[PDB]
Ligand binder design. Structure first.
Ligand SMILES: Nc1ncnc2c1ncn2[C@@H]1O[C@H](COP(=O)(O)OP(=O)(O)NP(=O)(O)O)[C@@H](O)[C@H]1O
Ligand SMILES: Nc1ncnc2c1ncn2[C@@H]1O[C@H](COP(=O)(O)OP(=O)(O)NP(=O)(O)O)[C@@H](O)[C@H]1O
Ligand SMILES: O=c1c2ccccc2ncn1C[C@H](O)C[C@H]1NCCC[C@H]1O
Ligand SMILES: O=c1c2ccccc2ncn1C[C@H](O)C[C@H]1NCCC[C@H]1O
Ligand SMILES: [Mg+2]
Ligand SMILES: [Mg+2]
Ligand SMILES: [Mg+2]
Ligand SMILES: [Mg+2]
Lengths: 478, 482
């Protein structure tokens, strides 16, 4: 099914991968796509995880409206907003905006529900769709005009507590990516120019696509401080009587996560799905031809299914009579099912099953008896091993450097760069403009993050010459 | 403020509005027909959602997300005043306007035509959870009828009608369970009339509910045997075993956040909401009998212990350990919210190894040893759940008057009752009955068919249509409706 090579035309391979796997169907409204069951079930897995996890922090789900009136919304973002002007042929008395994000919808309610210290912390989240008329090239999952996300918005008595929630959420994004999707990410802070301008400090969790050198933002979690509180009058009264503004966080993650998974683990044969989010972990394929024991094969397959299910192993028997076994191999292969269990006559009175692991192609003869624990063994190996190879690929792709003249060759090898920087407002804008100048002539490099994990700083700013403050990862991005 | 004061029988619209606001379910919003759903209500949606979702996954139905936008061209393939149209992004105009999805047939069925080429692709069984938008003409009502609502819409395609029908009824059964097992609301399975069915389909099935306080029937959910006309329209065909081109047989079905509203209305009383245990965010609220600046730690300590013990039985619990408020205040607070069980722990209870438990629906109190709490609160919840249902089933059936003749109509409607009547099912008849009960109500409002129930009461030979006097075929349930 898949004929483009990941390492040759990466955009075509991507498109082939997501289409031939049946994850995505193309659509006539530019920048929008149909998520098919095979993609959708993966979303449900990660949604269920994060949701359970934030529930344990006392976050509660809600649903606020998708419309916001012009007046409330309009108290680089403006061009993106979709506006409803009519119902039927009738013009609205005033046009209304489809929500691009929900601060202006939720925060007036907050000012109202928060009167007393008794009322904090207020922690809410919502799963919804968001619409932005994106100017950049859209890409299925990574950047779409309608996407699905969660946005979580909290308010607290103290900077201390809100900040602690910020890091807690960021940890859960690392887990969404690293634990669920086996995609390695790097926690850090955003530069003053990349952060959410309505907040005090933006934390982020950053990913990398080796095949085009692009960094990509996996998720984000903001300490908002008191700015939105003053703007929206979210004041509260302490236990000593005084009238203080609240300290807020907000944080979101999207269907982009799926796109990043697909890009990280995919190969020339198509998708490869980490076991932890695969709706089919093991596919069973009865081998049938010239009528050899047709009934005996099928009967065992059902025994094995109930078997493996005793272990919470998600199993599907590909039982369908209208497709050949070779067809079934290719299908589940392109779909990225982690384990294929093949079973014909030879393996019937042999008491075994052949099992092929999607990541490497390695095959195992395994006795009916040893399967459940040996598949559990393998599924952990697949999952651990996808993450590990990816962390290695990520680290091969970051060059540590000290001087500006190292930049372009790193960027030409499609690598990020870790460099000491004075964290000056202008330097970043200058660096973008110049890296564009050089790329045009041969592409803008930006700040991706200031990582939490700072190496030792014995040192001059790699661009300005000034005294450098911290190590900052840069690159081309999405 | 604190409590519900409008009486439920006597001031129904206002009771409703009070209960959903005071209880913290809903917050008003500046765009009409749209409302904020706070945790206290959202949790209930999450509950019915997981329930339904799990059941359809068992039937092999699979979830998807198709876009909320649809091109004007694709939407008007073949309601229009209800559609919301996007014309601009920022200051820039679109080449053509783009509609926000009002329902997804015109988005999904061209995709179905692509994906179905052969009998091996069948059956195709998809669902989606999404919001839907319609500029409703009628007065909006939180939950019951909103301009943004949440739903689930299912759309399947099959090789044979028989299989499609089997699914229509399976799904309809799931809707009965959604309302009856989850929400403790009784419903009546039935066939829509020719006039009230989905014009796009062969046969529409439904579950209908009844709201006694105002006498009006209300469609709780719907499941259609679509037949082959959409496949004809959208060119959804398949090559069968012998290479012949055939049209698929379709179903579609939906259920919305309306369900939360029908529940609220069914079990509420003058104190406010009453939430069935299967869906309540908090099932047991623990209320320590404390007062201002008393914090010895004995009582809270034991509340925290009790919570751990009940949580080990999967009971959902909250301790209301707030300082500025009395127990009496707290009692009322959680009654208004409809927490089904309140566990009271005072110094006196601490002294006996005992707690006092009061159940929201009846107010009956129980003294219970700490040891027994888990096993006795589980029993109590099953009893509340079941009692809410059985009492509402009875109010449903006491609200239905069987009748023989058209003269029995208006008296039955003025009692805020529905009517079950032998009906000849001829089409103009229904419209005549609408017009005629409309006019007769202004002079004192239209009665429409709600459903032809599956549960048909007996029909003696030679029975005649209550309205035309022609021979009656079956009983039809009629009333005022939402
Ligand atoms: N079009 C999109 N499709 C999918 N995910 C997106 C899209 N746009 C943004 N996201 C993700 O949504 C996350 C939270 O939203 P937000 O922080 O507002 O992003 P953002 O500032 O718009 N990113 P960017 O568009 O590059 O400026 C972002 O960190 C992105 O990873
Ligand atoms: N405004 C609304 N808010 C919430 N739920 C609704 C609303 N309108 C319809 N529904 C429910 O959605 C279910 C399935 O949708 P659908 O069959 O399209 O409704 P409908 O034909 O528009 N009913 P009606 O609007 O009364 O003519 C219906 O059976 C209703 O119970
Ligand atoms: O505020 C906007 C925004 C507003 C209008 C149109 C497009 C937008 N794009 C992005 N943003 C910033 C983020 O939406 C802010 C914040 N939202 C809640 C959680 C994610 C975080 O990015
Ligand atoms: O088709 C429409 C419709 C179309 C445009 C504007 C408003 C509409 N209101 C209702 N309907 C009919 C329902 O959409 C039919 C169908 N919807 C999804 C599946 C359930 C079934 O009721
Ligand atoms: Mg953006
Ligand atoms: Mg940005
Ligand atoms: Mg309607
Ligand atoms: Mg109707």
């Amino acid at each position: 099914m898949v004929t483009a090579k990941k390492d040759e035309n990466f955009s075509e391979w991507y498109t082939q991968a997501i289409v031939r796997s049946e994850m995505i169907e193309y659509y006539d409204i530019s920048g929008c796509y149909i998520m098919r069951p095979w993609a959708f079930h993966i979303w449900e897995k990660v949604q269920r995880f994060f949701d359970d996890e934030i529930k344990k922090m006392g976050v509660e789900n809600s649903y606020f409206p998708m419309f916001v009136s012009r007046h409330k919304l309009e108290k680089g973002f403006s061009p993106e907003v979709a506006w409803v002007t009519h119902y039927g042929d009738s013009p609205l008395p005033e046009k209304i905006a489809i929500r691009p994000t929900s601060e202006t919808i939720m925060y007036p309610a907050y000012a109202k529900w928060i009167r007393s210290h008794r009322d904090l912390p207020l922690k809410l989240n919502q799963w919804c769709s968001v619409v932005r008329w994106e100017f950049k090239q859209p890409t299925p999952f990574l950047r779409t005009r309608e996407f699905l996300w969660q946005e979580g918005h909290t308010a607290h008595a103290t900077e201390e507590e809100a900040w602690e929630l910020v890091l807690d959420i960021l940890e859960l994004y690392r887990r969404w990516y690293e634990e669920c999707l086996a995609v390695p990410v790097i926690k850090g802070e955003k530069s003053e120019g990349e952060k959410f301008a309505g907040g005090k400090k933006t934390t982020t969790v950053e990913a990398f696509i080796p095949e085009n050198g692009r960094g990509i933002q996996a998720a984000t979690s903001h300490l908002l401080g008191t700015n939105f509180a003053k703007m929206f009058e979210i004041e509260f009264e302490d236990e000593e009587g005084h009238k203080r503004l609240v300290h807020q966080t907000s944080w979101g993650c999207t269907t982009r996560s799926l796109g990043v998974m697909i890009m990280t683990h995919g190969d020339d044969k198509g998708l490869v799905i980490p076991p932890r989010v695969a709706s089919v972990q093991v596919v069973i394929i009865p081998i049938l031809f010239k009528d050899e024991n047709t009934g005996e094969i099928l009967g065992k397959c059902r025994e094995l299914k109930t078997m493996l299910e005793k272990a919470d192993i998600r199993v599907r028997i590909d039982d369908r009579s209208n497709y050949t076994p070779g067809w079934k191999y290719n299908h589940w292969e392109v779909k990225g099912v982690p384990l294929r269990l093949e079973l014909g006559p030879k393996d019937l009175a042999k008491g075994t099953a052949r099992v092929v692991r999607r990541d490497t192609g390695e095959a195992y003869q395994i006795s009916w008896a040893d399967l459940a624990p040996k598949l559990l063994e393998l599924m952990e190996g697949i999952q651990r091993s996808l993450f590990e190879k990816a962390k290695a690929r990520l680290h091969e792709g970051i060059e540590k450097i000290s001087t500006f003249d190292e930049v372009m060759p790193a960027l030409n090898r499609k690598h990020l760069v870790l460099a000491p920087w004075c964290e000056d407002p202008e330097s970043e804008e200058q660096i973008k403009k110049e890296t564009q100048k050089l790329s045009e002539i041969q592409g803008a490099m930006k700040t991706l993050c200031i990582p939490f994990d700072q190496p030792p700083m014995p040192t001059k700013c790699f661009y300005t010459g000034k005294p450098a403050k911290r190590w900052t990862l840069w690159g081309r991005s999405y």
